[PDB]
Amino acid sequence: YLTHQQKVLRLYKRALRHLESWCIHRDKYRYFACLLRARFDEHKNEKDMVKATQLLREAEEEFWHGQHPQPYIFPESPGGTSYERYECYKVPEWCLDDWHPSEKAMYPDYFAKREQWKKLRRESWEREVKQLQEETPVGGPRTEALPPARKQGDLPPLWWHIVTRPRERPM
Amino acid sequence: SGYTPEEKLRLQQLRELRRRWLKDQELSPREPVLPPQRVSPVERFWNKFLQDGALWKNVIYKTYRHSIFAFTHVLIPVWIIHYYLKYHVTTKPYTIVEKKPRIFPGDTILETGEVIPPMKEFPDQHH
């Protein structure tokens, strides 16, 4: 679900991107950037839930008629010509545990410091289980948001893979 | 609309941990611990002979490296290729077929010395 305000806010962002693609030039884009803002600003005060929504549907339907057929996409955004480009260099952390002992010997410090996290993970795991199962309603969670740690020495529940994700340019 | 009180904390805690994990990824000055390896004398020859700039004696390395490549990659294969063609391919019938050269009026034949008659007298006109 999305609130009515969010949908208008979303439409405001989308229209400017498509508008920018048509205009290209900054000054020409800058001129019309305020003109579109004017159309949004005036209808801010409309306090009728029925009339106000009806304005949005026309706003959405005018945008779809005037959208750029080839909108500019940022290179790494879904659809841009860099999306998922480096996903082939992202190897999960657990692949290290399979390294040959002679291969680990080339990085004595890194693997020595790795055991601190693995030791930290095992120590903190059971506490993370207890924290979640007391804040969890009887029927289970109703939303996907998670609580943070609520003591000293405790780590947020379900933190390992969020912390230990591969870098954006791992190679 | 913004973050709730706890969300600003979980991100702060996760971000604090995340940066700590990212710091560990750095390597020590010694790492990687390269195992000992035996190097040929020539590698020690060029490493020390090339410490100085000395443009004049550096170009020798360019010539040397090209000299080595020009021998083991161009000269030797043509010895094998030419040897292969001369005494094994050319000895069999029609393996290599040449298009006979074009003979023009007014030329002498190396094999025989025959002289081809020149063409007739053109009605020359410079236009």
């Binding site: 999960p92 390294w99 291969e103 791992p170 | 990824q25 750095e26």
Partner: peptide, 12 residues
């Protein structure tokens, strides 16, 4: 600045 690059085992 040198960063460790995680890769699958290459020894095998």
């Amino acid at each position: 600045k040198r960063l460790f690059i995680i890769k699958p085992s290459g020894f095998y």
